[PDB]
Design an enzyme around this catalytic site. Structure first.
Site, PDB file in Angstrom:
ATOM      1  N   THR B   1       9.806 177.755  48.938  1.00 33.00           N
ATOM      2  CA  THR B   1       8.487 178.143  48.381  1.00 33.00           C
ATOM      3  C   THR B   1       7.739 178.801  49.517  1.00 33.00           C
ATOM      4  O   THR B   1       7.840 178.360  50.664  1.00 33.00           O
ATOM      5  CB  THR B   1       7.711 176.936  47.811  1.00 33.00           C
ATOM      6  N   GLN B   2       7.058 179.900  49.221  1.00 31.38           N
ATOM      7  CA  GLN B   2       6.391 180.672  50.280  1.00 31.38           C
ATOM      8  C   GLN B   2       4.912 180.316  50.428  1.00 31.38           C
ATOM      9  O   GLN B   2       4.318 180.626  51.416  1.00 31.38           O
ATOM     10  CB  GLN B   2       6.531 182.167  50.042  1.00 31.38           C
ATOM     11  N   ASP B  59       7.988 171.010  44.591  1.00 29.90           N
ATOM     12  CA  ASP B  59       9.089 170.737  45.489  1.00 29.90           C
ATOM     13  C   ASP B  59       9.336 169.259  45.565  1.00 29.90           C
ATOM     14  O   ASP B  59      10.461 168.814  45.584  1.00 29.90           O
ATOM     15  CB  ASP B  59       8.772 171.264  46.877  1.00 29.90           C
ATOM     16  N   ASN B 108      13.085 179.692  53.452  1.00 28.44           N
ATOM     17  CA  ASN B 108      12.646 179.397  52.117  1.00 28.44           C
ATOM     18  C   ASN B 108      12.379 177.935  51.920  1.00 28.44           C
ATOM     19  O   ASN B 108      13.047 177.281  51.166  1.00 28.44           O
ATOM     20  CB  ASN B 108      13.698 179.842  51.152  1.00 28.44           C
ATOM     21  N   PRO B 109      11.369 177.429  52.583  1.00 34.65           N
ATOM     22  CA  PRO B 109      11.261 176.005  52.847  1.00 34.65           C
ATOM     23  C   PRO B 109      10.903 175.199  51.645  1.00 34.65           C
ATOM     24  O   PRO B 109      10.418 175.749  50.652  1.00 34.65           O
ATOM     25  CB  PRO B 109      10.084 175.938  53.806  1.00 34.65           C
TER      26      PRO B 109
END
Ligand SMILES: [Mg+2]
Ligand SMILES: [Mg+2]
Ligand SMILES: [Mg+2]
Ligand SMILES: [Mg+2]
Lengths: 140, 233
Positions: B1-2, B59, B108-109
């Protein structure tokens, strides 16, 4: 002609696929296993032959679980059975990942169905050497 | 997630003589809108591990699902899933830290900071932290977000060192944690009165407490604050 029984996707002139038939022999030749539907559940059981006294009792477990709610047991070529469950587990995970709900048993049956039928379509693979008895409890 | 959207704030935790305690409020915020109130950010895994999560909630929910599925897969061809070969904290943590570092490394953490608390089958306390960069560490106390700034200071007054962990009871540890939640309620604009708290004790096992509220608040003094400088009434 003859040798309709050498290649796997081939129809004999009576309409049959002899390699599947021969796989059934590998199954008829395996140990016994069974399923019993009770009226809110199911029960699986299986004969484990004792080759030798050197086997560790309790410890060569032949019934396998899928997801949390499905049991499979099988007679025949054991490694083929395990391969089939590994598939069934990917199939149930994918279904559940997308649809949230744990896979319904009929839905799961047809997943194994289609995958097994798929190994009777091509001569570059060999049909499964097992009959598999399985089931569990879904919302119906 | 950006860039994170719906977010959870501080998770806090400490270890005491026989186990660990961990807590987190029940809020998912959407910037400064306090949108979702019924949000559980403590995720128990088996009966010896609780994973607490802050940061992006979408997430978090993804991580929940990975944890369910780790439990499910560990059970496969595993006669001892409920015994010697159940999941330990140390395993769940390594797995998460692996995933985080990997996702970071693909730019893309998973936009989270996580604390895994538990008790190891050999009796030992487990408490480790990992976050969106894959960074990890352990300490007798651990907290994310604001908690690092306000909770740790207070919890370290109880367990300043290793040697103090044996001396610290579960009554003392718990009261410390509850007080911290009250402090964060007072001072974190992204926080909620309601929270969940969990204990993992090597004798009592996992006690999970939902639906707590911060109580014993002091506001009365506020009645004597008039103006900002020179106004008297
Ligand atoms: Mg964060
Ligand atoms: Mg595994
Ligand atoms: Mg991995
Ligand atoms: Mg007062």
């Amino acid at each position: 002609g003859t040798g309709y029984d050498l290649s796997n996707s081939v129809f004999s002139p009576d309409g049959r696929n002899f390699q599947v038939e021969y796989a059934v022999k590998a199954v008829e030749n395996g140990t016994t296993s069974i399923g019993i539907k009770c009226n809110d559940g199911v029960v699986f059981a299986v004969e484990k032959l004792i080759t030798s006294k050197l086997l560790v009792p309790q410890k060569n477990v032949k019934i396998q679980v899928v997801d949390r709610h499905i049991g499979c047991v099988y007679s025949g070529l054991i490694p083929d059975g395990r391969h089939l469950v590994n598939r069934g587990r990917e199939e149930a995970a994918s279904f559940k990942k997308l649809y949230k709900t744990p896979i319904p048993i009929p839905a799961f049956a047809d997943r194994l169905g289609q995958y097994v039928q798929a190994h009777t379509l091509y001569n570059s693979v060999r049909p499964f050497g097992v009959s598999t008895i399985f089931g569990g409890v879904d919302k119906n | 997630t950006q860039q994170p959207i719906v977010t959870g704030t501080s998770v806090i935790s400490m270890k005491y003589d026989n186990g660990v305690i961990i807590a987190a409020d029940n809020l998912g915020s959407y910037g400064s809108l306090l949108r979702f109130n019924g949000v559980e950010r403590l995720i128990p895994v088996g009966d010896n591990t609780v994973v607490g999560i802050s940061g992006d909630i979408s997430d978090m929910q993804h991580i929940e699902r990975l944890l369910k599925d780790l439990v499910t897969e560990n059970a496969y061809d595993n006669p001892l899933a409920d015994a010697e070969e159940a999941l330990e904290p140390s395993y769940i943590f390594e797995y998460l830290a692996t995933v985080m570092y990997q996702r970071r490394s693909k730019m893309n953490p998973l936009w989270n900071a996580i604390i895994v608390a538990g008790v190891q089958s050999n009796g030992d306390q487990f408490l480790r932290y990992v976050n969106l960069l894959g960074v990890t560490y352990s300490s007798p106390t651990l907290a994310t977000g604001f908690g690092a700034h306000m909770a740790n200071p207070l919890l370290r007054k109880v367990v300043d060192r290793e040697s103090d962990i044996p001396k610290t009871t579960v009554q003392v540890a718990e009261e410390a944690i509850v007080n911290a939640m009250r402090v964060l309620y007072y001072r974190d604009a992204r926080s909620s009165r309601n929270f969940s708290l969990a204990i993992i004790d090597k004798n009592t096992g996992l006690t999970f407490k939902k639906n707590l509220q911060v109580e014993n608040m002091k506001w009365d003094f506020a009645k004597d604050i008039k103006g900002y400088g020179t106004q008297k009434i």
